[PDB]
């Protein structure tokens, strides 16, 4: 049973002039929210030594991306939009789970999805102390596989994001979004 579901989509098609929010029904919190970016965010992952892997993404380009997404979401719910890490799930939707030069990487994305974009575009609550691009810690999956005496490097463009939106009521004035998902059969029409 192959689980086709993710947090980030890599190297896929791009929307032509602006970001696109797609869902079989946007009101249905149980149906997937697919984001198709218009300009991609580059992500470089690598393994220098044993027990050391991470991914890097430019912080500014990423955050500026998130904003442009939060504006498109606001076309459906005109309020403050929040991104947050998932409350549960399997590896495929709990982390960025990808193939890097053969190896199985899985990195947590807690710093990719931790922000609040308020009603005026002005967004994130605190003015940021950190100037450097974003570092996602990874781990590799065994499988007892013999050691690799190389430097592992892979280069992917982030194309889109897969989101589920919180449900219920006591949530406040905000619509919250997380990188969850269901399987993606029937996703390609336009």
């Amino acid at each position, epitope marked *: *049973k192959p689980v086709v579901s993710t947090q980030l989509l890599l190297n896929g098609s791009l929307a032509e002039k602006e970001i696109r929010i797609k869902s079989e*029904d946007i009101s*249905d919190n*149980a*149906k997937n929210i697919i984001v198709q970016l218009t300009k991609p965010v580059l992500i470089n992952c690598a393994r220098p030594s044993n027990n050391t892997q991470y991914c890097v993404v430019n912080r500014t380009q990423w955050n500026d991306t998130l904003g442009q997404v939060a504006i498109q979401l606001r076309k459906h719910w005109n309020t403050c939009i929040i991104f947050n890490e998932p*409350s549960g799930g399997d590896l495929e939707i709990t982390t960025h789970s990808f193939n890097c030069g053969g190896e199985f990487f899985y990195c947590n994305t807690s710093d990719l999805f931790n922000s609040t974009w308020n009603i005026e575009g002005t967004a994130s609550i605190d003015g940021t102390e950190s100037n450097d691009d974003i570092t996602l810690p990874c781990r590799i999956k065994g499988s007892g596989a013999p050691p690799i005496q190389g430097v592992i490097r892979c280069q992917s463009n982030i194309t889109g994001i897969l989101l589920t939106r*919180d449900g219920g009521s*006591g*949530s406040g004035t905000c619509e919250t979004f997380r990188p969850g998902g269901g399987d993606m059969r029937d996703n390609w029409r336009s």
Partner: antibody, heavy 125, light 102 residues
Framework: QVQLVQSGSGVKKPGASVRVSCWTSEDIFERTELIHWVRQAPGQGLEWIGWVKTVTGAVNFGSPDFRQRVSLTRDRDLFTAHMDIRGLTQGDTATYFC????????????????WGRGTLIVVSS | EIVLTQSPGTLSLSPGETASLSCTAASYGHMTWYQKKPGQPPKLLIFATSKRASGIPDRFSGSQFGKQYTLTITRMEPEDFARYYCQQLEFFGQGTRLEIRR
């Protein structure tokens, strides 16, 4: 007819925790996109607690409180949903139902065709 | 907030006469209906807005007008006297109860 089989009732101390399980026949679990948990306090309505996807294990909740204190999991091998409540309180004394959503195209709404018999949980000192 | 308002809260009829419950939603969205007797789980009646669940008599009927979704039970038989609930996505109405009029 076809049943969703639900784990047994309990009487739990305040603050303690509780697991309610729900399982079914492979042929049925395969046709199932989501398992929802719905509760009913006595003399009250049905309140939606949350859902788990069978395929990815993804979740969602009807309230922050629920999202904090409730964990929804599945074992695709045993065709089984589990709902875990922690830090119980009298406000949790209710009958808990598991319920099924067949795979559906967006815009049909939420319809639950199968339901468990329902598990009574009593929180009292 | 309120997304669903169900009315009436109690409706009294004789068997034979026809009952109509309504459920007025704040937003357009396909309405689902359940029957509910005590000590029993809900019984799915109607989904989409007009579709009839499997093994559900012809006398149950889902209609819509604007944002007002209604359930009609046309030739009331004794078993139909129970509570009824609407559901629009994650939200349930507060429920109408059918009672016998004497």
């Amino acid at each position: 007819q076809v049943q969703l089989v639900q784990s047994g009732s309990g009487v739990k101390k305040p603050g303690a925790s509780v697991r309610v399980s729900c399982w079914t026949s492979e042929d049925i679990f395969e046709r199932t996109e989501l398992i929802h948990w719905v509760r009913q306090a006595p003399g009250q309505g049905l309140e939606w607690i949350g859902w788990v996807k069978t395929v990815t294990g993804a979740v969602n909740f009807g309230s922050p409180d629920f999202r904090q204190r409730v964990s929804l999991t599945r074992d695709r091998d045993l065709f089984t949903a589990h709902m875990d409540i922690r830090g119980l309180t009298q406000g949790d004394t209710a009958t808990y139902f598991c319920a099924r959503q067949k795979f559906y195209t967006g815009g049909q709404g939420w319809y639950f065709d199968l339901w468990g018999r329902g598990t009574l949980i009593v929180v009292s000192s | 907030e309120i997304v669903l308002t169900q009315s009436p809260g109690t409706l009294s009829l004789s068997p034979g006469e026809t009952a109509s419950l309504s459920c007025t939603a704040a937003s357009y969205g396909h309405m689902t209906w359940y029957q509910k007797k005590p000590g029993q789980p809900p019984k799915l009646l109607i989904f989409a807005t007009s579709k009839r669940a499997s093994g559900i008599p012809d006398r149950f009927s889902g209609s819509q007008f604007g944002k007002q979704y209604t359930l009609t039970i046309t030739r009331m038989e004794p078993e139909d006297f129970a509570r009824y609930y609407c559901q629009q996505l994650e939200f349930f109405g507060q429920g109408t109860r059918l009672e016998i009029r004497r």
